[PDB]
Amino acid sequence: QYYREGTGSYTVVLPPGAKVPQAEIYKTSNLQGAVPTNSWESSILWNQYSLPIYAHPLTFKFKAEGIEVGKPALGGSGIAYFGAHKNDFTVGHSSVYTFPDARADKISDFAVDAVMASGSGSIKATLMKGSPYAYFVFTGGNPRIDFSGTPTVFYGDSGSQCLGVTINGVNYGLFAPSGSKWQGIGTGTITCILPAGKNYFSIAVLPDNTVSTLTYYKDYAYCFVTDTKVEWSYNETESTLTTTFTAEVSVKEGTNKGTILALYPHQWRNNPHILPLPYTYSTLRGIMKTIQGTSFKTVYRYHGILPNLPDKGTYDREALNRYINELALQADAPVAVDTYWFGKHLGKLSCALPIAEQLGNISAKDRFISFMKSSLEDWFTAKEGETAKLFYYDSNWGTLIGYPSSYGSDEELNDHHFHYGYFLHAAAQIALRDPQWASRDNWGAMVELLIKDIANWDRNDTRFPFLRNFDPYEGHSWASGHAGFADGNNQASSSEAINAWQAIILWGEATGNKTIRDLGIYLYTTEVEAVCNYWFDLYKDIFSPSYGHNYASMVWGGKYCHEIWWNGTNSEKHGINFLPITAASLYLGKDPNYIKQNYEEMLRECGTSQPPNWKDIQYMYYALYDPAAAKNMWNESIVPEDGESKAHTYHWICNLDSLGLPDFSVTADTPLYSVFNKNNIRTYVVYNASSSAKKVTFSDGKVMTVGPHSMAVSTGS
Ligand SMILES: [Ca+2]
Ligand SMILES: [Ca+2]
Ligand SMILES: [Ca+2]
Ligand SMILES: [Cl-]
Ligand SMILES: [Cl-]
Ligand SMILES: [Cl-]
Ligand SMILES: [Cl-]
Ligand SMILES: [Mg+2]
Ligand SMILES: [Mg+2]
Ligand SMILES: [Mg+2]
Ligand SMILES: [Mg+2]
Ligand code: NA
Ligand code: NA
Ligand code: NI
Ligand code: NI
């Protein structure tokens, strides 16, 4: 049947030939509502056991015997750097040597509980991103710790409560209940003889082999993490985005209450709200610092986005208008009609629409808006017997899938944020112009279902899991639905994730929905912060000296590398983390010197003096360092990348030529703004999406009054 949402609808009738994710979900009866996907723990759900689980600092893998535990040995040189999962020891069971599967029982914002059970025993494991601990509860027998070789025992004996061990050069604590004994010390398998009535057991990866360190880790070893939560707040007055991270602990014994949290660089860098412990871990993501506590916060400065750049460029206006007319002839001509390529086309129209309006090209404006609306209205309606341009709800997993699908959006739940971000961008641009169309009673209900599929914010709405594609702790998104790879989950295009997030900001502000807007600000701001570290390494302290590049195109749980999914040029390899370039893409230019370094690396790698291909994308990027040079190199012979247009490319470059480069040293008390700086002259741009005039104040003292539903630009003091 069919479910009405405002004036649109989705279906639960699968079109003929259409494919869905697998029927089998390796979950327990405790995991209710829509099933989380697109994360680091996801392979537990899709595979009988799991693929490697990249929590950090620890990694894991489920198998018939139990749970492999390890700390990756970092290495590699050149095109990739590796932190592969390896087995330092397997947490097995004294009487159950073969478990039939591993099933997810509970998934929180940065942890997972999984259960392995036979009729005669079980292990329940809690794996946590940002913890040096892993926590276990046994039934039917004892922990049987099967080491990869024989460990060195640096502390403890058969009668001690804990052991300090070293295996593969990695120090661990093994923490048993008071009253436990240990059998098999000196062999490759140590069994923890649990006392009657106590069945909890934990391990930690330690930063050293001192007894003092082991004592500190023992102090918190019995504070088992039972829930993890993020919360966020956008402060409009201060232009900041605050995120709180909270772990709930259940104290299994002792009088200590707390835990040790490990923080990635995007969390600890320049963070005045923490007092790190001495302990660090060297990980694939850089140095993880540690803190004592069950909560911490991060606070980032938000620098605004715009719905478009203003009409301030040094372009030949008649040529720009002609480019708009050239695009208008192709307004109804997507290169392909699956969700992804249809999206790319909708993004192209979304970026050209305001340029047509600025020029007074009503014919082209009308062609663009008409196609955007008619196509969204088609996609957002599932007609009986329709096989293309519709959304289907899978109620096994709990996901909205558009048909026709592509690149595993259907069977693998890949990439929904990438695909749907383009649809959301188009919807937002319509909403800024037409509050009637975007209302919940009209097309806004279906729009918000796409938002919920990729980024549901409401933990009580069980139709979609909480924040599907975004990983709150790594601070970025994940592309694979299942993470069914040795190297875990992956994301290549961070810029396509950010496109979805900027679109959510615009939608929320256009519709007056502060919850959705602030969700967008949270996602956007945090992903940008992660991107600046793990993709661009702006601070020059993430990437190994042995890694041969200043840029990683793909980030995995277990590696990062300068590769892409097809045999493209090095221009393509760099460009996938720029496109789509929108008026939310100024973050790419946080460090103009990095723009220069990144572009020059790309040229060296191509063996050319200009980009061999994707020259439009590359010159838009280079314009964040030298717009005059980018304008000079640009020309009409360039065949646009399929999601781009000559009009939008040249409007971008020529506006930066006039306005200057983005200036991140100034903020404002409004959500839609940007500041530009040309040779120390600032230009301030604001968009007011509300129905009342706004007074906008910048941190340097600039004040602008901006009328309802308008863009304003002011240069100088
Ligand atoms: Ca339809
Ligand atoms: Ca149709
Ligand atoms: Ca997620
Ligand atoms: Cl002890
Ligand atoms: Cl106690
Ligand atoms: Cl004309
Ligand atoms: Cl339809
Ligand atoms: Mg499984
Ligand atoms: Mg062994
Ligand atoms: Mg360095
Ligand atoms: Mg030129
Ligand atoms: Na190349
Ligand atoms: Na074009
Ligand atoms: Ni490169
Ligand atoms: Ni030309």
UniProtKB/Swiss-Prot annotation:
GO cellular component, one term: extracellular region
Catalytic reactions on record: Hydrolysis of (1->3)-beta-D-glucosidic linkages in (1->3)-beta-D-glucans
Positions that bind (1,3-beta-D-glucosyl)n: Y340, K344, D415, H419, N490, A492, E496
Temperature dependence: Optimum temperature is 75 degrees Celsius.
Domain GH81: 14-660
Main location: secreted
UniProt-listed GO biological process terms: cell wall organization; polysaccharide catabolic process
Residues holding Mg(2+) 2: K631, N632, W634
Record-given protein name: Glucan endo-1,3-beta-D-glucosidase
Organism: Acetivibrio thermocellus (strain ATCC 27405 / DSM 1237 / JCM 9322 / NBRC 103400 / NCIMB 10682 / NRRL B-4536 / VPI 7372)
Gene this chain is encoded by: Lam81A
